[model samples]
Target: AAQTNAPWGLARISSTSPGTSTYYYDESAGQGSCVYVIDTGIEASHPEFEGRAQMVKTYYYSSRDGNGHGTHCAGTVGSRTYGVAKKTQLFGVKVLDDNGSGQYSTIIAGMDFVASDKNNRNCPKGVVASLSLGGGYSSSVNSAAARLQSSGVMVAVAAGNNNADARNYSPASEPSVCTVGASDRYDRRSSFSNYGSVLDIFGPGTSILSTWIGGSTRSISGTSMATPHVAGLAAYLMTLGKTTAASACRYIADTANKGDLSNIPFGTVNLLAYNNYQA
Candidate 1:
């Protein structure tokens, strides 16, 4: 449990929630922002959600999380203790099925649904979308991501877990999106994480703990785990009254923990994200 603490990512990103003021910086923890987890379905009854999360619409069989992956990412995006935006409104946009598989067409349709569906009426300019699944590049999906950005939705996608170049992945290669890779507790890039110029940032993904399907918590690893860290940060930035994905992404890259990956080829500009560390 201690190994998978949620604050690990928050503390690493120089962000912190207010309480007894134990962190280096105490500020808003992602209130009034909405985060959509477009992965496997999310269990609406998960205790960590506490009725705050909406099941939005599952593109597949049931709205329930037959697999726990979506709920896990949801917890990291916004749960009481394991989340970055403690008060963000979470909606599950299931693209993957119970078997963790989905067609690219289905994925595109799901993204479009959230971007313009009547479900997102009013459609403010500060919603954050997080996707932890990816395959090789897809031109159509990339185009949809660009359209979503034009509509004021910020997207965070995984760099994939194949240990190959992230540029080869679909959402990772998608333009104007924050592409995330995995980092371990020691701040080194996770061995399984895909790397390259496409990766926008790294976060605590290895052995990370978060809410699970049984209303309990579990530790998992992957770039899928890493993407939500940056997604949560994006949502937190939105809560600070900041809109537009580009500026929020720039702020993160410029303020992240530096020199943490000198021995690797990820990128000179790439840094380990921290929410409580000073610049």
Candidate 2:
């Protein structure tokens, strides 16, 4: 039976209406794909991940997640319960610190690792990277993210929470990446979500509930939370044979729920992420 009270964000993406209270998705959507969560880190032992999440690389000394941001994002991407792609493999690539902060150089280094892994012959064929962190415009970060995409990895980034133009941000401003904004259950643009011509799509980001540290759950709001939802969708698209970053991006934009959102800024696209699930 379909859940009557699934996470609102999850339920929102699977259907066109807001009050359905159910998340309908293909059971095998992300079975053969992998998502690299480039954030603070992830709690690989969290029950939500069901042992599918792993700490693949870290810029920090410890592999543990002192902050719950990364784990929350990872859960939204592919947790057994609160995920967009429920079966996707999750790789935690720690770039941010315990305070959810990192330098552009360190962040780029993480992207470089993903590119290296993609280039390796034994790497997973369906690769996607979810980047929920960003700062002021940095050419170095943009170039690195673009190179990662060029290496055949679909990259999704948060537009930002500053409510300003995403064009002033780093990865969000990069044309080659999928820059995601945030919307709410009412199909309204999130008040704190950044916007502009750079944003590719919007996802449910207000009060999103997902896995947290200490094997628990929490509801938080940010463009950071919205990004992984699209990343998970990208992974699902890869399983459907959308292998390249360009192809996945094109499909996501083309298939997204269009023009239903309110409070959108002039230059921002009104497309909302969807998994193509039907009743």
Candidate 3:
């Protein structure tokens, strides 16, 4: 993280680094809420995590979390110290374990579980799946996406970090899904975040502060890091009756802050629109 008197802005690309709280707090908050996070693993015991994270399931396609990307993605949704949805519940699933690799089948299988599982009933009313992984988009995901979307689930995925068009990935390119591209704290689209006509939206992605495995903090970057910012925003929108994936995404895109930078194609986003839809 960058040097800062406040941890929220430290190492962040902009003052808005504390974007989770920016969206989660009540524009007129009468009640707080939670959301479902599908990732590799998260440090449930971290101080920032406290009661915020609710582990719905913990599975690994291969081994335990050797690399912390999945865990980091989970924290982006519910980390108490810096998450937007601090008061929200974070549901966890380990799609990848130690190797930091997963078959496309393994990844979609988790989404299938979230939509079909019965034990997740306590969280049945308002659920959003936040995933920070990327693989080739193909006919397989196109087929699987129908089932997940049909089941009343909204999924947020990271645009690839290749700094190219995201139409090549399934979830990010899915017409109905919300694909989050990375931007700096100042709101400029990341040079590395994949973007194109097929991509859905953008969020704060640079130098984010959130939970790491074993309860530590590190500076991480990538669209993988950017995906959860939108996921947390979805939780705030979910509490406001924006139940479907499409509607919830509108809440964020409408408010996304398009950047003041010179090279950005879309310019900026309307994050305030994100709050108003929830309001």
Candidate 4:
């Protein structure tokens, strides 16, 4: 396995053991794939992005990430030091506002923009969207997510921070979306991570370190953080020829480390996200 110093989240995804400190990855890691971050805007100028991150559209006031949520999520997806897929292109589609809040209309509009971009004749081969926000059940939100999935964008959504069933959430409950829950460094379900049959997989979320605003780094925790790790994995798989959303989802599930997490709630899958690396 190729070894390098990395964040716990990145390192954990590449190893089967619980106490690993090194991240192993393939040379093709997300080369030629793209991941769209749909949240508060991103600070594309952050040095961690290494000029690969850009804001393509925004429903909010500016493309700048005032809330820092989107930037952190983007870093986990493909930052130079903290990402799962270091070579993946990062696009920011701002749906949420500076406070990390948004209505259905703005969120749906962002989704529409991503779908249209993916359908463009000159678009890249692999496209994935990292949605790290969610609320209560909303049919419109679910429908929009389904449409985005049908348009061939792999949508990885947060299963919400609520400890209750993820089935009660909107996009997380959507069958076509890849709902992600949170697990800690010790392979235990995060106390605040939502669970249930809606979750497709778990990713490291507790105190995860990633790039933040002002060209800085921070350690935060949530299912939101977990979702981007899965998004990065999906983007990486796309570079390996799992181009379609369905195919990427299937490949993620099949390649993920099984029965590695503890305290998995009833109905939640026992699968933890992995990058298909072996030591």
Off by over 4 Å in 3: 1-24, 27-34, 58-64, 242-246, 258-262, 266-279
The model with the greater TM-score, 2 or 3, is 2
Give the per-residue lDDT of model 3 (tens digit) for 67-120.
677667767776755665555677676776656666778777877887776244
lDDT of 3: 0.62
On a 0 to 100 scale, what is the lDDT of residue 272 in model 3? Answer: 19
RMSD of 4: 1.4
Candidates sorted by TM-score, best first: 4, 2, 1, 3
lDDT of 1 by residue, 175-208 (tens): 5787788877666788888888877778777887
lDDT, candidate 2, 213-253, per-residue tens: 99999999999999998999888777766545667876888
Provide the TM-score for each candidate, comma-separated: 0.88, 0.96, 0.81, 0.96
| Candidate 4 structure lDDT | 0.88
Model 4 TM-score is: 0.96
lDDT for 106 (candidate 1): 90
Task: Show the colliding residue pairs in model 4.
Answer: none
Show where candidate 2 strays beyond 4 Å: 1-4, 119-125
Angstrom error of the Cα, residue 228, model 3: value is 0.7
